């Protein structure tokens, strides 16, 4: 029962990375009027959208609103085994900070960080980390 829950905006970078992974995936809807229920254990994969805001790093909007809405449902929240976050290192100290923020809020491990649609190595590594997360 390997499962990914993920979010991706209209740019579909995170979507394309997840479709390269072995495990089955479920997409959190872009439309803020729509919600999903997940009743099985999952690894969460989300991009970062804080936009490198500074006050010190400002983590406001790091986690997309649709991901917050999804995690706000305690039925969904309890099934999260860990978070993988994405972004771009050119955002500096704000790189992939959606991961740490979710890791802290849920009390779950930050399993991996990657960029854009990911590389061959990212697929190989995330496949292994998800397998070990569900086995352990």
């Amino acid at each position: 029962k390997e499962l990914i829950v993920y979010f991706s905006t209209q740019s579909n970078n995170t979507h394309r990375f997840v479709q390269k992974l072995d495990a089955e995936s479920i997409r959190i809807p872009i439309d803020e009027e729509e919600r999903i229920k997940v009743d099985e254990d999952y690894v969460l994969i989300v991009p970062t959208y804080s936009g490198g805001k500074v006050t010190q790093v400002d983590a406001h909007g790091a986690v997309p609103k649709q991901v917050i809405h999804f995690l706000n449902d305690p039925d969904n929240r309890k099934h999260c085994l860990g978070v993988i976050s994405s972004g771009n290192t050119n955002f500096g100290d704000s790189f992939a900070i959606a991961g740490p923020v979710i890791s802290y809020k849920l009390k779950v491990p930050l399993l991996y960080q990657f960029e854009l649609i990911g590389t061959k190595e990212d697929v190989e590594e995330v496949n292994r980390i998800i397998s070990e997360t569900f086995n352990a």
Binding site: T89, N90, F91, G92, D93, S94, F95, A96, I97, P100, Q113
Partner: peptide
């Protein structure tokens, strides 16, 4: 040197 670009790396 990469740490100077992003400490989060």
């Amino acid at each position: 040197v990469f740490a100077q670009l992003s400490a989060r790396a």
